[PDB]
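agent: user wants the structure for Poly(Beta-D-mannuronate) lyase from Pandoraea apista. delegating to structure tool.
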Amino acid sequence: DCPAPPPGSPDIRAIGYYTDAARSVIDPRLKTQNDAAVKPLNAFAAHVAKFADAYAKGADEAAGRCALTWLDAWARSGAMLGRMAHVNNDQSDYMRQWTHGAAAMAYLRTQALASEQQRTDIETWLKRLSAANLAYWDNPKHKRNLHYYWTGVGIMATAVATRDDTLLNTAQGIYRAGIDAIEPDGRLPMEMARKRLALHYHDYATAPLVLMAEMARLQGEDWYTYRQGALERLAARVADGYRDPSWFNTQSGAVQETATPKASSGWVEFYRLRSPDPMRFDAMHAAGPFQDPRMGGNLTLMAQEGIVPLP
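agent: tool returned. relaying tokens verbatim.
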């Protein structure tokens, strides 16, 4: 019983909700308007990740076809390929980057059940989404923070699913841009300027880089070896900050919000299997399970069973 797919409009009109210069203080009304506006995008992502999780469970190919049913529908309608709105900020482009990621991840781990018209429809739609998100960064005034790192997620999964080598090289450049931006002390300067949200924005910048390196294993490449030691410092700062936020308080100049690891912090399931000091990540691991549609669904299960379940 595959549920009805929601409509896939070409246009996205998301609304920025930050009111300060450091983009750290949130307007309740401006947030609630954005959520309702992006609700079809947030609903599409959660279901296709859920449909991928049920397929990964085993003995549930219908769930796998259900995710393809949803992806095919948004592919043929040209979803997210139309007009991008800039109310206050570029939130619409950011939502296109996340939803394309969730869409690509759901396709990457379910494509084994795809039909030939489902392949042409979804892969073509995934490639134009990859191109549209990429060209957005050609304006050098768009500053390449975690939204740039998150852009590589949809491109990387599109490249592994379609064996597109140019899209692979493009995603690799996004990943290496993130690793190269880490300072010797393990900080990300554009994420440290977020005042009370410096720890949250260091944590959500680590997730796209971990997921991209984990998808590189699927093509037999170990991207964790690029400038080895840098990613460890940034992940170590995140884990330490959840235990004691004093370093983020000093370097950001503002006391951090008190929040527990959740959702995209599930990159720690993947990275604890790789770190030279995996016990630093015990406390974050204990806060699981971890699921995030923008990263493919359940991160604890994918960290144990692999990202693509064997057909």
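agent: one observation worth passing along. The CA atoms of residues 261 and 272 lie 14 Å apart.
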